Design a protein around this ligand. Sequence first.
Ligand code: CL
Ligand code: CL
Ligand code: CL
Length: 227
Amino acid sequence: NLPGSKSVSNRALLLAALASGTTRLTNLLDSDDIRHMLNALTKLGVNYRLSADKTTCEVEGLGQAFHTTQPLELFLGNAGTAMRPLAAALCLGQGDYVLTGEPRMKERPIGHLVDALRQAGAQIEYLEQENFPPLRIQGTGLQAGTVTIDGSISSQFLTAFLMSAPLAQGKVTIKIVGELVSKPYIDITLHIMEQFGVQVINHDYQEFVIPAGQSYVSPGQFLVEGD
Ligand SMILES: [Cl-]
Ligand SMILES: [Cl-]
Ligand SMILES: [Cl-]
């Protein structure tokens, strides 16, 4: 048996948290980076039941974006695979967050994702160095409309944006400039979103359209693929 992909484990934990219903994730990776994501979810008010072997986690979904009141620091050690999807998702609801981690987290570049979120109206501030964590993020919701993303962008940034786009105020259209790289990785993300009940119209990787009014819905069990 092969363990779950770290990035798939954290992305599926975040969708399970946003989704209606409880999702039993299986083959979850037993890793501290998954624990940093669980800890963020706990601080954000999400309940879950984690099995003794740490590879099974039932996440009780909020059925909508996070809404916290007290300003919160979310310290994520060196978990890039938790920082990136959260930088986007934290813009969707209500709250005031500092997204940060250990000194090495501050060396993880994040500017291309911040730029995409800001095209959709996000309120994000760099607290130390431009283009890097720590970030101060305000929950504002994301605006409907067209955003333009470069085809050479690292897939993890495009993925983080796509995962949050269904919870924007209306239809989101992502235009890609040039030839999109890492198409198979984008495919994995689109597949996970589909399992959580969301449709993304893919125009041969030149444009992605996320119709308005969708919600993530628990598929019951989500099996985390290897890699
Ligand atoms: Cl990483
Ligand atoms: Cl990532
Ligand atoms: Cl990715």
